[PDB]
Scaffold this motif. Structure first.
Motif, short mmCIF file in Angstrom:
data_model
loop_
_atom_site.label_atom_id
_atom_site.label_comp_id
_atom_site.label_asym_id
_atom_site.label_seq_id
_atom_site.Cartn_x
_atom_site.Cartn_y
_atom_site.Cartn_z
N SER A 7 1.25 1.90 0.03
CA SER A 7 1.83 0.66 0.52
C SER A 7 3.20 0.47 -0.06
N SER A 8 4.09 -0.12 0.72
CA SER A 8 5.39 -0.44 0.18
C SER A 8 5.27 -1.33 -1.05
N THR A 9 4.44 -2.35 -0.99
CA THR A 9 4.21 -3.16 -2.15
C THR A 9 3.91 -2.33 -3.38
N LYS A 10 2.97 -1.39 -3.27
CA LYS A 10 2.65 -0.57 -4.42
C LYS A 10 3.91 0.12 -4.91
N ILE A 11 4.67 0.68 -3.98
CA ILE A 11 5.88 1.40 -4.35
C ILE A 11 6.83 0.50 -5.09
N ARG A 12 7.15 -0.63 -4.48
CA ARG A 12 8.09 -1.54 -5.11
C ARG A 12 7.66 -1.81 -6.54
N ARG A 13 6.42 -2.21 -6.72
CA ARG A 13 5.90 -2.48 -8.05
C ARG A 13 6.26 -1.33 -8.96
N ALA A 14 5.85 -0.12 -8.59
CA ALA A 14 6.12 1.03 -9.43
C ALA A 14 7.57 1.00 -9.81
N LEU A 15 8.43 1.04 -8.81
CA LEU A 15 9.85 1.08 -9.05
C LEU A 15 10.24 0.10 -10.11
N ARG A 16 9.82 -1.15 -9.94
CA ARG A 16 10.14 -2.19 -10.91
C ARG A 16 9.78 -1.74 -12.29
N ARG A 17 8.70 -0.99 -12.43
CA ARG A 17 8.20 -0.66 -13.74
C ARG A 17 8.68 0.68 -14.24
N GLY A 18 9.55 1.32 -13.49
CA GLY A 18 10.10 2.59 -13.91
C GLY A 18 9.11 3.72 -13.79
N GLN A 19 8.18 3.61 -12.83
CA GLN A 19 7.12 4.60 -12.70
C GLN A 19 7.55 5.96 -12.12
N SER A 20 7.34 6.22 -10.83
CA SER A 20 7.63 7.55 -10.31
C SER A 20 7.99 7.62 -8.84
N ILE A 21 7.07 7.24 -7.97
CA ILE A 21 7.43 7.25 -6.57
C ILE A 21 7.56 8.67 -6.00
N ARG A 22 8.00 9.60 -6.80
CA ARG A 22 8.15 10.97 -6.34
C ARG A 22 6.89 11.49 -5.64
N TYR A 23 7.05 11.99 -4.45
CA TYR A 23 5.94 12.52 -3.67
C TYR A 23 5.17 11.45 -2.91
N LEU A 24 5.59 10.20 -3.04
CA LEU A 24 5.05 9.13 -2.21
C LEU A 24 6.04 8.85 -1.07
N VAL A 25 7.32 9.16 -1.33
CA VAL A 25 8.38 8.97 -0.34
C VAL A 25 9.19 10.24 -0.25
N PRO A 26 9.90 10.42 0.86
CA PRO A 26 10.71 11.61 1.05
C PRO A 26 11.77 11.64 -0.01
N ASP A 27 12.13 12.84 -0.46
CA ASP A 27 13.11 13.01 -1.55
C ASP A 27 14.46 12.31 -1.35
N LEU A 28 15.12 12.54 -0.22
CA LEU A 28 16.37 11.84 0.04
C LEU A 28 16.15 10.37 -0.15
N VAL A 29 14.98 9.89 0.23
CA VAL A 29 14.71 8.49 0.03
C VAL A 29 14.66 8.19 -1.42
N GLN A 30 13.78 8.85 -2.15
CA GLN A 30 13.73 8.55 -3.56
C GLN A 30 15.12 8.59 -4.16
#
Ligand SMILES: NC(=O)c1ccc[n+]([C@@H]2O[C@H](COP(=O)(O)O)[C@@H](O)[C@H]2O)c1
Ligand SMILES: NC(=O)c1ccc[n+]([C@@H]2O[C@H](COP(=O)(O)O)[C@@H](O)[C@H]2O)c1
Ligand SMILES: NC(=O)c1ccc[n+]([C@@H]2O[C@H](COP(=O)(O)O)[C@@H](O)[C@H]2O)c1
Ligand SMILES: NC(=O)c1ccc[n+]([C@@H]2O[C@H](COP(=O)(O)O)[C@@H](O)[C@H]2O)c1
Ligand SMILES: NC(=O)c1ccc[n+]([C@@H]2O[C@H](COP(=O)(O)O)[C@@H](O)[C@H]2O)c1
Ligand SMILES: NC(=O)c1ccc[n+]([C@@H]2O[C@H](COP(=O)(O)O)[C@@H](O)[C@H]2O)c1
Lengths: 227, 227, 227, 227, 227, 227
Positions: free
Chosen positions: E179-202
């Protein structure tokens, strides 16, 4: 009104607040039905011949129970089963206690949980007619958190259903579940047990390091059901 | 190693084997972590000003606890909160006990179950910064049967997650669940309670008919969270 | 032995095989307990005054029921309630039929599913003392697929629990669940209904296009529970 | 549009409202897709050779279906399978009826429930290529309360998935579940059955004491799947 | 065969592998039905006017999609919605694209997940006739892990059910849920996101610190559904 | 701080975004604990000797992983194990890499999902002392969607519980679940795979038609756990 006496056969490895609570539950039930008056409750630790895994020697089991009940005005232990040389079929134990009473006729009735009951389906664990006779001539009181399953199980079997008027399922609101197994395991890991069993019990346990793992290894070869 | 002292704020209507077991659980945990040594546990019954439904007057609550703990070498009651004229915010109670200790610095840490924790989301029940300060400066130990939910809940909140290293979820294998509510209800119906609470407690209860329904009617008008 | 007469109050929008089966289930239970003998069953459709959503006019409800029961030896309809000018509290209906019987005293007992039962908790829908009188002076027989829930619900209430010995929960093995709602819906979409309701009913329905949606819009404004 | 005939093979011990409803469900679905027009439905009770436990003689099975369908405009019984001296693989029966029609070509399609479908995984029960042929050249219509499971089931099988376009899962809102087993049990116990099966059926059953238990003991020795 | 274009309206805050997978799922389904041929897929990020909480400026949303689709042969972005000065009802956007095509007529079909669909029940969120028109004149393709729910949802609605032949529920075996929500949260927390979204995106995201929390506070005041 | 190197042994049939995400998750955890610093991650595909069903030749597995990791700064493949003539016990592989490091001592730790963990209970699959050594001298980091289960599993075992302080369960919020199995399946049926695995992988797969079914038949005879 029909006086009644609740018999509870069971390994009773570490007897625990649960088994004690069961009696509390069953009593309040039958008394609360109006058609009954609970006169006394009997704990009957299994003999060592039963040969179940991790079954420590009876002395400890009988002792612990007694300690367990020292403070009860209506639940008493009873050692006749634990002394027999041969493992005793529940049916025989029930008869025994009933016969004893016949020496104004309080009916003995089997106290139990779901497992026991459901174990009726294990192949070769019970003598089909044993079940019958039990349910037929002596009641069966089952206290459980899993009321429904217990009731399906009954529905599921012609023998049980036929004698359903002698089977009562007692609902355990407020979850018990302090299984012997979990208690042993705890002990084994130096956990706490405190509050899950009666103190004298705990104390008997800690001064005696009763449960080890060497202990759980006990009887690693076929129980006494296989006839 | 870091000595610790577990504070347990709560209504503590009928204190019960559960609340006692919680302490048993929390201790075994922290001690078993190696980075800690549990020095003492404190029960702190809420004041009457809290004004929650069915909250009988503190004297009984403090008494019962004490009776409850009479036999414990490390859990003691503590009445400071129950005497205050105004209801006390948990944060203030934690500070209190910590400040007291500062008069070799055992950290006070909030003992609790899931409800408390999850109540953090109730609107207006907590001061956002109160939560922060709590979690930040004093730990939060949560023992539950519902481990996961507790952990999602944490995951779910930036404040909690940020300070997650100060929050420990302790798994309650062996189900407790002897809720105050179920116990009161039982009492009300003349059930049994025996084995769900410590004897002196029971006895204090039965000689004093503490729980009635007239009693449960107590405080039928808004608790002291609404500031 | 205690003769009994099963009273079922209900909107009985499309009566369906379910409704009929409930009586069959209820009876087999009572009779199978030994303490009882089911003498007759009464279906009493609600009046139009109840003013529930999508409640088509009593005439159709009354007739459909009669057709539904034309071939039953023991279940008959009863129109007393559908005729009253003002909606009638179930307690009054129970009383009525009981008093009529007293003109060798068959106890009238309320036949029921879970919903009705569980609705005892909806605010303002029932007069507390009404429930009491009901359960106290007239039994309550509740057949459901949701045994436990029903039992919890009982456990969960002082009033009901108190008179538990006059409340029987009959388990419905084999799923019914042909709700009136579902059938309306179906009708609405030209589905089938056949085999869910008695033929004479199906027939009366299809020759009369009873359920539409214009019909479902009926009474879009507050039922007669609000006193 | 493609006219279709729904064929249902099954023991059809007590045929029940369920079985009939299935047809009504399947039809509504296919017709409601626009790609189809359901012409006729066929009930084909299995032969005695199948040798299933409790399988009473075919003639009773066929008669009861016929009574059950007496008043249906489109569902008729078919005895060709019940007369065969050797048990018939479903594939052969499908062919049979198809062939028959080929003497404007209505496709025969297998009507069934979940268990049948799920039985495709039972070892030795089905000839892999039989499954293939069935699903490939004749459709498979499956009505179920357990929609998802059925669909996972398909997803989990290369064969089925490959022909998924010929398999339709029809969702049963409003619970059936009137299993023949449940019925038989009831009958044995003197329960009711009324409203679970068509009246002529029930009457045929009551006047013939068809299900007993001596009957349930029938064929206590391996069915004719094992080739 | 009927060529089709799948249109997906959505905030598309961080577009993620999920969103992309949806298209891959929908396609495979339609193409695998034989009745269809998926020609092109269109991503249409919502405008800023929608005023959803945490909705970062459109340009970022559109760019990120474009990077996410850079290497797709059939899924392209579409900015017409993001440029409108007033928020656009999905129905208008559907028309828009359809109209566009009408200038050999590929049907536009709405691609979506469960929430969207289930949001049809939110009060005031959708114009009843809008739903109608959508489902009637443009299809609705819903891929979900929650197949059943989606299908009950349809069953429970007259409007949807009536047009069910234009609604396809596509089952997602293998769990998405990024979910985008999950992603956003991660981002906020300095998590990872890598492999959840396309690389150019990350990379686009890392080099722009796009999600913060000051960002999540965006639009803390009623979205533009309330007409 | 304790530098760490994450070792992941596994068949790594089609490596997938999941596999990659596990490393991302594992690292964020350790680093986020403060007591640790993740230095490098190693992917070590199984040798062909393992002889598991559908295990295509190491060469493809090794290469795909490398492509999969080509763009990672910290996760590298390692072929030591795939080259050995005889299947290698994970304990030996752990030892190997640890010993290699000892030629400032980064602890190697076993990266893992639930399955592997839970397989510690399969009879004969693991040498009891192997588990012990593993957990004792090398940590075990297990990332899952099934947190509790994993934790129970631990609770449920003396050995693991004993060394619990070297086992961390990392919760995977946001569902992964792209199992190799599912992807094989898909491939088999010409589905998609895109976005579930890294592109270079997808590409290497499609230009090489790696997974067939002839391939799935590989090794239809007893794996190398049986000693
Ligand atoms: N055929 C029988 O009568 C039969 C078979 C197995 C167990 N039992 C009994 O049930 C018991 C076992 O329960 P526990 O394992 O909790 O002790 C016994 O106490 C015991 O005697 C009876
Ligand atoms: N804002 C706050 O700090 C706050 C709000 C509500 C309850 N509490 C507390 O949690 C408690 C209530 O739990 P019980 O209802 O089990 O007693 C209290 O003991 C209490 O002090 C604290
Ligand atoms: N207070 C009451 O006596 C009371 C309240 C609500 C419903 N009822 C009734 O019991 C009934 C059951 O209603 P339904 O079966 O249609 O939901 C009613 O028909 C009804 O009137 C009685
Ligand atoms: N290969 C086959 O065609 C095959 C195999 C096993 C069962 N069957 C059949 O499916 C059936 C289902 O019957 P029941 O659902 O009543 O057991 C049968 O009637 C039966 O003959 C067919
Ligand atoms: N009447 C309508 O067409 C209508 C109503 C509410 C939402 N929507 C929309 O559906 C959307 C879903 O967006 P999210 O899933 O990201 O919130 C929107 O993008 C949006 O504009 C349309
Ligand atoms: N006794 C052992 O050391 C042992 C036993 C079974 C599997 N394993 C291994 O851990 C691995 C995980 O296997 P999968 O990830 O393919 O199920 C293996 O690759 C494997 O070889 C080790």
């Amino acid at each position: 009104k029909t006086e009644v006496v609740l018999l509870a056969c069971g390994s009773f490895n570490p007897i625990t607040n649960m088994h004690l609570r069961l009696f509390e539950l069953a009593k309040d039930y039958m008394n609360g039905t109006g058609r009954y008056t609970v006169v006394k409750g009997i704990i009957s630790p299994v003999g060592d011949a039963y040969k179940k895994k991790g079954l420590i020697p009876a002395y400890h089991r009988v002792i612990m129970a007694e300690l367990a009940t020292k403070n009860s005005k209506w639940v008493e232990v009873d050692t006749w089963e634990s002394l027999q040389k041969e493992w005793k079929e529940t049916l025989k134990v029930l008869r025994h206690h009933q016969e004893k009473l016949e020496a104004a006729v309080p009916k003995v009735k089997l106290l139990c949980g779901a497992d026991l009951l459901e174990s009726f389906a294990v192949p070769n664990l019970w003598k089909s007619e044993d079940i019958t006779q039990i349910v037929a001539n002596y009641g069966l009181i089952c206290v459980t958190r899993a009321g429904n399953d217990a009731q399906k199980f009954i529905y599921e079997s012609d023998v049980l259903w036929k004698h359903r008027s002698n089977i009562h399922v007692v609902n355990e609101w407020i979850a018990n579940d302090i299984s012997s197994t979990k208690i042993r395991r705890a002990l084994r890991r130096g956990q706490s047990i405190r509050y899950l069993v009666p103190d004298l019990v705990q104390e008997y346990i800690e001064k005696h390091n009763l449960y080890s793992s060497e202990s759980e290894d006990r009887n690693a070869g076929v129980i006494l059901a296989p006839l």
